[PDB]
Amino acid sequence: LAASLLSMIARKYGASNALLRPKLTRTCLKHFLDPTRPPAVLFGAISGVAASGGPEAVRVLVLPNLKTFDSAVLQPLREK
């Protein structure tokens, strides 16, 4: 629900405030690229990236590193 609310806020008031979208997407991306976080934090970070950045930011940022992220987090978690 918070992710949806943030997405709507960013889509609405992103022009009056110039740096809102870059800041939100950058923070979410920085937090996402950290295996030390638990699954909940990573889920929240990916959701925030998708909500704020938009389809283009997702496609151009998350896809290249998915192969590494898989072996990094999913496989260790898949064995649980």
Binding site: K30, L33, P35, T36, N65, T68, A72
Partner: peptide, 12 residues
């Protein structure tokens, strides 16, 4: 360590 540096470079 080895993972932390790799992920930091990836974020950069």
């Amino acid at each position: 360590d080895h993972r932390r540096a790799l992920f930091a470079d990836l974020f950069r």
